[PDB]
Amino acid sequence: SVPSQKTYQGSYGFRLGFLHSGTAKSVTCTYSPALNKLFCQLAKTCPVQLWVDSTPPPGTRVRAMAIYKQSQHMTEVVRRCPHHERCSDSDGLAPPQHLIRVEGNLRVECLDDRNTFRHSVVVPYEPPEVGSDCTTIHYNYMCYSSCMGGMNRRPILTIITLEDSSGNLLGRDSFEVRVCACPGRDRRTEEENLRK
Ligand SMILES: [Zn+2]
């Protein structure tokens, strides 16, 4: 079983947005539109924008889940490595196995699927505040892409799903993630490789 990654705006015109953070050596999180790839440092704040054309109903939720990008690894549950799952960096709510956490949201729910064993993290959808045109979720990635016994240098995708109160699909978007020491350099390197 592999979760779908098919982009789907749905009835509410759901899609993600990313800040424009640049590629300075010091940047902690940066997004490449050309690669559809987020580059970030370990456990640092990753703002992800939620855009809609119309407001979805009360009880709508937003779920994040990771899958391996390569087809030969897609059936493997993405989880934290044997070191990081035991490093007692708990935030009180996220299970220590979970790669993706949501920062600063007390209504977070952390799911371990009883059938697929995949991890996900879900929060209620809130419409944009006064003076904002979108809503933002702050994500943290809790292992490096290179962590041995975990992602093990394999690329992952994050799948963001807009769901109704039963968990039915309303919209879907996705992006590749690399968790690394120097996001700014790595984004520049991979974008240069793409041009070449
Ligand atoms: Zn790790």
Author numbering: 96 to 291
Sentences from the paper on this structure:
The tumor suppressor p53 is inactivated by mutation in about half of all cancer cases. Most p53 cancer mutations are missense mutations clustering in the DNA-binding domain (DBD). Due to its low intrinsic stability, the human p53 DBD is very susceptible to inactivation by destabilizing mutations, resulting in unfolding, followed by rapid aggregation at body temperature.
Tyr205 is located on β-strand S6 on the edge of the β-sandwich, with its aromatic side chain packing against the L2 loop. It forms hydrophobic interactions with Leu188, Pro190, Val203, and Val216, as well as a hydrogen bond with the backbone amide of Val197. Most of these interactions are lost in the crystal structure of the Y205C mutant, accounting for the high stability loss, and there is virtually no collapse of the created cavity, apart from minor rearrangement of the Leu188 side chain. However, the mutation-induced cavities for Y126C and Y205C are relatively small compared with the extended surface crevice in the already druggable Y220C mutant. The Y163C and Y205C mutants in the L2/L3 loop region harboring the zinc-binding site were also significantly stabilized, with maximum ΔTm values of 5.6 and 9.4 °C, respectively. It has, however, also to be noted that the binding epitope of PAb1620 in wild-type p53 includes Leu206 in the immediate environment of the Y205C mutation site.
